[PDB]
DNA sequence: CTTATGACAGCCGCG
DNA sequence: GCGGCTGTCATAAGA
């Protein structure tokens, strides 16, 4: 097999790399790497090395890496560019691995672990590690085994051993329902004391040292906890054994109010799963805990247990340990679904970076561009320092707040990356400046053509048109690779099924390879379909990773810490987008006025960053609503009209803009997204806007896919807000469903009924939610001080009423919290109360809270008020005989 | 982050 | 005694 790296670290003047050798064995090596860096030289001197500006550069080889750094500082002090890859780990990887890295995941130790720490006095802080580690479940991907470490004796109890037998049994049998898939894979180790467990774990760690170390919240908790626990007990020198190179950096990151401890374990790649999810699932989840995410992804979640976690070990050690086994397994299941680790390995090996740098677009892009330019003997720029200077961003239109009966939306694809390639934006491609007219002038073609020589963005910038820019080239390359790998994708995935359906690879091979294959087999047709499906697996991941690069380019480009950052270019990109969405609002409005025989009608009712929303009202009126045999008939009509009449007019429009800005190539393409409207022959309103980023739509067709039942596309509204009570999210969604599909009378009936039935709803279902941030800041001795927000006052009411019970769950800084208003004259002595979320409120006050809460204020605050928002905008009433003069701001 | 809106505190001015 | 309006805060929604 072809050699590939596992981890890389620079320590002093050495690279410490762990890598898989040519056979497949994991080994480690220490190289005294000699980096090269580059300086500008006379045109007299001949090299093969040029900077991206075409200026010639001397390659300077250094005896070691400390000579290189000291040269850079010394070159900085003189005032001359010191160019080339300043991060030597990367430059090393580029040197040692000058080929397309093929990697065998089978030879990469991916560790999955979670610990348990019984704490009777609140959250066990990792940087303290006050309390003993009583359970460690560590999953190893090579042995494919769950190594379970069980503390039998601790200050908090002596417990029996965990039973594998009981664990397997059903819930109703007294069992833990530990999945049969893992029962023969658990390896169990009880211990008599914490010292033995920890040292056996550490000795386990040296034998089976992780390459990729993952698991839920491991980077914020499990890892610092273990390190500090071992540090504090055995000495720092023992805790450092947790690194295959015995070097650890202790880092304290700062927040929006506080800080956090992270431990860098040199020679290991920490890919916390809570980060691998946030990064590459793309789903704005309301809670990022493992219970939720696991329920979401697997509909199974974490193991249930009676009582507080802090009393679990003594009351039910059996549940406790299995709880810890399932936790790890849950994580492994999610990854069996999403493949986020393999995604990371693929990206990390593609860009040739440390795998943990996948969370950095800057690092990933820098390397991709570095390797690319190195291959053509080019030299990258020195990272220049830059003042963080806000520039203009995405355009969003003010919508006139209204009901909107028929809407079609359109989206420019990859707007920003597309703009880069279209205008040819790149540091070295900057041609010059032109006088800037107001943006609206360029938007209306009224302005003077900026240049007939150079490619242009309406921010005043001019770019070389002939040249191939670094940035535009490197992104085009990724676009191409995307198409390519989606090519093998839609081949092994598409042509593959021909082999599968017959039983009853990158390109669909000639009808001689497909011909000589027709003999029904158990060794062939059904075991060679395993190949075609495993091939498309590779297609997906390669394509997802290209998509991820494409979208995370502007972010890197807009970051002052990026080698290729340039404020005028960032501003060029976004300003160009700003004109492009609005130029096409003009072009669509003009086309639709011509076609409809109207003049000066606002068809585009909303536009946001890369997409427009278009009223289809008059287009329907042209046919007249009455010629459609059903809903699906007009959805057909509008779809055809879009693809046939509207999109060529859109393309004609953008082609005109391209000639106007004099761009290198025309890459402004709009797909048609949603088609929305009411069900035929109904009183529904279809859709409505209340303002920027707030709207609901009744959608029948999202780009191609024609839905069975209609589905609500709701954006920004209270339904989409975790702060909204469970019951109330539900009702407002219904309120909206009823508004759009059924009409005003439906809504009024629903409103009346819910209002009538409010007090019979669960108190948890009707309590609002919010995060507890800056709890101290407004805590004036347990009472609310100046400027104190409503929910924190709510907490400081719970506290005073609760200061004295240890059984009572304390409210912690950071924690999400149920809030409830309280009726005047309440014992609790305040306008509201708040308690920890996802929990029933303690019996000590519960029955008295349920008595004092203000239903009127609650319903008004969380339901009626935001409803009034929707109905006001949609020109509807949620109850009869509402005087129409309310509409006016007298 | 940049684009946002909305809940709520607290100012100022209002015979 | 509330509008009007600025500032903290919470949270989308796509990067």
Cβ-proximal residues to A886 (8 Å cutoff; 6+ apart), any chain: none
A335 CB less than 7 Å from any atom of strand C: no
Residue for token digits 């056996």? A200
Q: Report how far residue A13's alpha carbon sits from residue A92's, in angstroms, rounded to the nearest whole number.
A: 12
- A708: which residues sit within 8 A by CB, 6+ positions away? none
Residue A12 DSSP class:
T
Cα–Cα nearest to A342, from A97, A106, A93, A140: A106
Residue with minimal CA–C1' distance to B7 is A790
Which structure tokens are listed for A52?
A: 């991206």
Taking the alpha carbons of A656, A661, A666, A667 in that order, is the dihedral positive or negative?
negative
Backbone angles phi, psi at A70, to 5 degrees: -65, -25
Give the CA-to-C1' distance from A868 to B13 in angstroms.
Answer: 29
Nearest to A248 by CA among A273, A233, A267: A267
Cβ contacts of A334 within 8 Å, gap of 6 or more: A273, A277, A293, A294, A297, A298, A340
Tokens representing A750? 């629903």
Alpha helices, H only, A509-566: 529-551, 554-557
- Degrees, nearest 5: CA angle A436-A441-A447: 70
Q: Which nucleotide is nearest to A788 (CA to C1')?
A: B9
Q: Shortest CA–C1' contact from A609: which nucleotide?
A: B3
CB A415 within 8 A of CB A609: yes
Q: What is the CA radius of gyration of chain A?
A: 31
- Alpha carbon A368 to its chain centroid, in Å, reads 21
**Can you tell me whether residue A400 is helix, strand or coil?**
coil
* Of A820, A798, A819, A823, residue with least CA distance to A809: A798
CA pair distance A329, A215, nearest whole angstrom: 10
Residues (787-806, chain A) with CB within 7 Å of strand B atoms: 787-790, 793
- For residue A658, give both structure tokens: 């391209």
- Compute the distance between CA of residue A616 and CA of residue A273 in angstroms, rounded to an integer: 45
**Residue among A723, A761, A719, A758 at smallest CA distance from A736:** A719
Alpha carbon distance A109, A141 (integer Å): 6
Between CA A609 and C1' C12 the distance (Å) reads: 15
Q: Are A86 and A36 in contact (CB under 8 A)?
A: no
Contact A277, A341 (CB under 8 A): no
Task: Give the closest residue to A509 by CA, choosing from A494, A498, A499, A495.
Answer: A495
Q: Give the nucleotide with minimal C1' distance to the Cα of A361.
A: C15
Q: Apex CA A498: angle with CA A493 and CA A501, to 5°?
A: 110
d(CA A310, CA A556): 44
Residue A721 and residue A681 in contact, taking contact as beta carbons nearer than 8 Å: no
CA A220, distance to chain mean position in Å, is 18
C-beta of residue A151 within 8 angstroms of C-beta of residue A134: yes
User: A688: which strand partners?
Assistant: A403, A696
Q: For residue A252, what are its two tokens?
A: 């304290």
Q: Which residues contact A541 (CB under 8 A, 6 or more apart)?
A: A339, A342, A343, A346
Which DSSP helix (H) or strand (E) runs through A613? strand A611-615
CB A162 within 8 A of CB A150: yes
What are A161's two structure tokens? 């051993």
Report the SS3 class of residue A205: helix
Q: Cβ(A545)–Cβ(A539) under 8 Å?
A: no
Nucleotide with minimal C1' distance from the CA of A787 is B9
DSSP A268: -
Cα A65 to Cα A88: distance, rounded to the nearest angstrom: 8
Nucleotide nearest to A401 (CA to C1'): B5
Q: How long is chain A?
A: 890
Q: What is d(CA A351, CA A343) in angstroms, rounded to the nearest whole number? A: 12
Backbone angles phi, psi at A385, to 5 degrees: -85, 145
Query: CA A327, A329, A333, A335: dihedral to nearest 10 degrees?
Result: 80
Spatial distance between the Cα atoms of A888 and A871, rounded to a whole number of angstroms: 15
User: SS3 for A241?
Assistant: helix
Q: In Å, what is the CA distance from A63 to each residue of A12, A371, A708?
A: 13, 22, 69
Cα(A275)–Cα(A817) distance, integer angstroms: 23
Neighbours of A93 (CB within 10 A): 26
Locate A128 and state its tokens: 């303290």
Alpha carbon of residue A880 to chain centroid: 44
**Please, how many CA atoms are within 13 Å of residue A275, restricted to the half-sphere of its CB?**
16
Please spell the DSSP secondary structure of A336-375, one letter per residue.
Answer: HHH-HHHHHHHHHHHHTS-GGGGG-HHHHHHHHHHHHHHH
Other CB atoms within a 10 A radius of the CB of residue A772 amount to 20
Distance of CA A752 to the CA centre of its chain: 40
Q: Using the structure, give the distance in angstroms from the CA atom of A419 to the C1' atom of C15, rounded to a whole number.
A: 15
Distances from the Cα of A498 to the Cα of A492, A520, A858, angstroms: 10, 13, 59
What is the C-alpha separation between A843 and A833, in angstroms, rounded? 15
**Contacting residues 686-745/A vs strand C (CB within 7 A):** 693, 714-717, 720-723
Provide DSSP, A106-153.
GGS-EEEEEEE---SSSS--TTT--S---EEEEEETTTTEEEEEEE-E
Q: Where are the beta strands (DSSP E) in A152-200?
A: 153-154, 157-158, 186-191
Give the N- to C-terminal CA distance of chain A in Å, as an integer: 80
- Residue indicated by tokens 């005109």: A656
Alpha helices per DSSP H over A803-854: 843-852
Contact A373, A470 (CB under 8 A): yes
> A289 vs A136, A216, A292, A295, A856, CA distance in Å?
19, 8, 6, 10, 33
Query: Quick check: A866 CB within 7 A of strand B?
Result: yes
Q: What is the dihedral of CA A527, A532, A536, A538, to 10 degrees?
A: 70
C7 nearest neighbour residue (CA to C1') = A787
Distance A325 CA to B5 C1' (A): 44
A393 beta carbon to strand B: under 7 Å: yes
Closest CA to A36 of A383, A380, A366: A380
Q: How far apart are CA A813 and CA A797, in angstroms?
A: 15
Task: Write the DSSP string, A409-424.
Answer: EEEETTHHHHHHHHHT
d(Cα A699, Cα A710) in Å, to the nearest integer? 6
Is A393 strand, coil or helix? coil
The distance of Cα A178 from the centroid of its chain, to the nearest Å, equals 31
Q: Which nucleotide comes closest to A772 if you measure CA to C1'?
A: C10
Q: Is A269 helix (H, G, I), strand (E, B) or coil?
A: strand
**Which two tokens mark A648?**
């060529």
Sheet with A212-214: list strands edge to edge: A186-191, A145-151, A135-140, A110-116, A212-214, A269-270
Q: Which residue is nearest to nucleotide C3 (CA to C1')?
A: A889
Domains of chain A, each with CATH number or no CATH? 2-106+340-382 (3.30.342.10), 107-339 (3.30.420.10), 383-468+560-716 (3.90.1600.10), 469-559 (1.10.287.690), 717-768+854-875 (1.20.1280.300), 769-852 (3.40.1820.10)
Comparing CA positions, the residue from A691, A714, A698 lying closest to residue A400 is: A691
Question: In strand C, which positions have an atom below 7 A from any protein CB?
Answer: 4, 8-15
What distance in Å separates the CA atoms of residue A380 and residue A387, rounded to the nearest whole number? 21
User: Distance between CA atoms of A16 and A10, rounded to whole angstroms?
Assistant: 6
Torsion of CA A121, A125, A126, A131, to 10 degrees: -20
- Copy the structure tokens of residue A343: 């995604």
Q: What number of other Cβ atoms are within 10 A of residue A6's Cβ?
A: 24
Q: Which residues contact A367 (CB under 8 A, 6 or more apart)?
A: A90, A94, A351, A352, A353, A357
Sign of CA dihedral A450, A456, A461, A464: negative
Which nucleotide is nearest to A857 if distance is taken from CA to C1'? B7
Task: Give the Cα separation of A180 and A331 in Å (integer).
Answer: 17
Angle, CA of A789, A794 and A799, to the nearest 5°: 125
- From the CB of residue A196, how many other CB atoms can be counted at a distance below 10 Å? 16
Question: Beta-strand (E) ranges in A144-226?
Answer: 145-151, 153-154, 157-158, 186-191, 212-214
Q: A606-625 burial string, b = 16+ CB within 10 Å, else e?
A: bbbbbbbbbbbbbbbeeeee
- CB within 8 Å of A39: residues ≥ 6 apart: A57, A58, A60, A75, A80, A81, A82, A83
Q: Is the CB of A670 less than 7 A from some atom of nucleic acid strand C?
A: no
Residues A476-503 as b/e (b if ≥16 CB within 10 A, e otherwise) read bebbebbeebbebbebbbebbeebeeee
| Token pair in block for residue A35 | 């980096």
- CA A416 vs CA A571, A649, A652: distances in Å: 11, 22, 20
Q: How far does the CA of A773 sit from the C1' of B8, in Å?
A: 15
Could you tell me whether strands A186-191 and A687-691 are parallel, antiparallel, or unpaired per DSSP bridges? Answer: unpaired
Query: b/e for A300-338, b at 16 or more Cβ within 10 A?
Result: ebbbebeeeebebbeebbbbbbbbbbbbbbbbbbbbeeb
Q: What is the 3-state secondary structure (H, E, C) of A39-77?
A: EECCCCCCCCCEECCCCEEEEEECCCHHHHHHHHHHHHH
How far apart, in whole angstroms, are the C-alpha atoms of residue A229 and residue A263? 13
Dist CA A178 CA A190 (whole Å): 18
């Amino acid at each position: 097999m072809k050699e590939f790296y596992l981890t890389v670290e620079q320590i002093g003047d050495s690279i410490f790399e762990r890598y898989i050798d040519s056979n497949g064995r994991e080994r480690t090596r220490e190289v005294e790497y000699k980096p090269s860096l580059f300086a500008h030289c006379p045109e007299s001197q001949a090299t093969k090395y040029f900077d991206i500006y075409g200026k010639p550069c001397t390659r300077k080889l250094f005896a070691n890496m400390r000579d290189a750094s000291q040269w850079i500082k010394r070159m900085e002090d003189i005032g001359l560019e010191a160019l080339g890859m300043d991060d030597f780990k990367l430059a090393y990887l580029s040197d040692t691995y000058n080929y397309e890295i093929k990697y065998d995941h089978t030879k990469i130790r991916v560790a999955n672990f979670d610990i348990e720490v019984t704490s009777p006095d609140g959250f066990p802080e990792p940087s303290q590690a006050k309390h003993p580690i009583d359970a460690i479940t560590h999953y190893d991907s090579i042995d494919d085994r769950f190594y379970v470490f069980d503390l039998l004796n601790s200050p908090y109890g002596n417990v029996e051993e965990w039973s594998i037998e009981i664990a397997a049994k059903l819930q109703e049998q007294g069992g833990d329902e530990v999945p049969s898939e893992i029962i023969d894979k658990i390896i169990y180790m009880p211990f008599d004391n914490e010292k033995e467990l920890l040292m056996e774990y550490l000795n386990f760690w040296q034998q089976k040292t992780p390459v990729i170390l993952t698991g839920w919240n491991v980077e914020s908790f499990a890892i610092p906890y273990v390190y500090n626990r071992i540090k504090n007990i055995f000495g720092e020198s023992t805790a450092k054994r947790l690194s295959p190179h015995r070097k650890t950096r202790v880092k304290v990151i700062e927040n929006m109010y506080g800080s956090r401890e992270i431990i860098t374990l040199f020679g290991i790649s920490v890919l916390d799963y809570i980060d691998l999810y946030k990064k590459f699932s793309f789903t704005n989840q309301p809670s990022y805990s493992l219970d939720y995410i696991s329920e979401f992804e697997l509909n199974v979640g974490k193991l249930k247990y009676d009582g507080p976690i802090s009393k679990l070990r003594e009351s039910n050690h059996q549940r406790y340990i299995s709880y810890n086994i399932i936790a790890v397994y849950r994580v492994l299941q999610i990854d069996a679904k999403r493949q986020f680790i393999n995604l990371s390995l693929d990206m990390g090996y593609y860009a040739k970076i440390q795998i943990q740098s996948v969370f950095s677009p800057i690092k990933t892009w820098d390397a991709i561009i570095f390797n690319s330019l190195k291959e053509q003997n080019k030299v990258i720029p020195q990272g220049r320092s830059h003042p963080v200077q806000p520039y203009p961003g995405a355009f969003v239109k003010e919508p006139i707040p209204n009901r909107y009966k028929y809407v079609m939306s359109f989206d420019l694809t990859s707007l920003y990356p597309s703009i880069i390639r279209q205008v040819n934006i790149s540091p070295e491609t900057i041609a010059g400046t032109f006088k800037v007219a107001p943006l609206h002038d360029y938007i209306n073609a009224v302005a003077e053509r900026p240049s007939d020589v150079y490619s242009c963005s309406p921010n005043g910038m001019m770019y070389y048109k002939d040249r191939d820019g670094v940035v535009p080239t490197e992104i085009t390359k990724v676009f191409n690779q995307r198409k390519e790998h989606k090519g093998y994708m839609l081949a092994a995935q598409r042509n593959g099924e021909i082999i599968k359906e017959a039983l009853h690879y990158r390109f669909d091979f000639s009808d001689e390879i497909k011909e000589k294959i027709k003999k029904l087999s158990a060794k062939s047709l059904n075991e060679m379909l395993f190949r075609a499906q495993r091939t498309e697996v590779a297609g997906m991941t390669a394509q997802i990773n290209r998509k991820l690069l494409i979208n995370s380019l502007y972010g890197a480009l807009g970051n002052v810490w990026f080698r290729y950052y340039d404020l005028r270019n960032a501003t060029a990109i976004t300003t160009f987008g700003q004109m492009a969405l609005q130029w096409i609002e003009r072009k669509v409005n003009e086309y639709l006025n011509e076609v409809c025989g109207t003049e000066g009608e606002a068809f585009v009712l909303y536009g946001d960053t890369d997409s427009i929303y278009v009223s289809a009202d008059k287009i329907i009126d042209k046919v007249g609503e009455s010629k459609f045999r059903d809903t699906n008939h007009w959805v057909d009509f509008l779809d055809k009209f879009a693809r046939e009449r509207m999109e060529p007019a859109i393309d004609r429009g953008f082609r005109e803009m391209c000639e106007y800005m004099n761009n290198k190539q025309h890459l402004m393409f709009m797909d048609r997204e949603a088609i929305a409207g009411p069900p035929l022959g109904s009183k529904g309103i279809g859709g409505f806007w209340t303002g920027k980023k707030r709207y609901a739509l009744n959608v029948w067709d999202m780009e191609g896919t024609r839905y069975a039942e209609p589905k609500l596309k709701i954006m920004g509204l209270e339904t989409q807000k975790s702060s909204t009570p469970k019951a109330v999210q539900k009702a407002l969604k219904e309120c909206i469903r009823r508004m759009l599909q059924e009409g005003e009378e439906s809504l009024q009936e629903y409103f009346k009924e819910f209002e009538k039935e409010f007090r019979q709803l669960n108190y948890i279902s009707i309590a609002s939610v919010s995060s507890a941030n800056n709890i101290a800041k407004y805590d004036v001795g347990g009472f609310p001080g100046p400027k104190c927000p409503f929910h924190i006052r709510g907490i400081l009411t719970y506290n005073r009423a609760i200061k004295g019970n240890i059984d009572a769950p304390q409210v912690v800084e950071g924690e999400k919290v149920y809030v409830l208003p309280l009726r005047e004259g309440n014992p609790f002595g305040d306008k509201c109360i708040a308690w920890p979320s996802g929990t029933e409120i303690t019996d000590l006050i519960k029955d008295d809270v349920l008595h004092w809460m203000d239903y009127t204020v609650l319903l008004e605050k969380t339901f009626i008020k935001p409803l009034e928002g929707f109905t006001s905008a949609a020109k509807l009433d949620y109850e009869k005989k509402a005087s129409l003069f309310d509409m006016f701001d007298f």
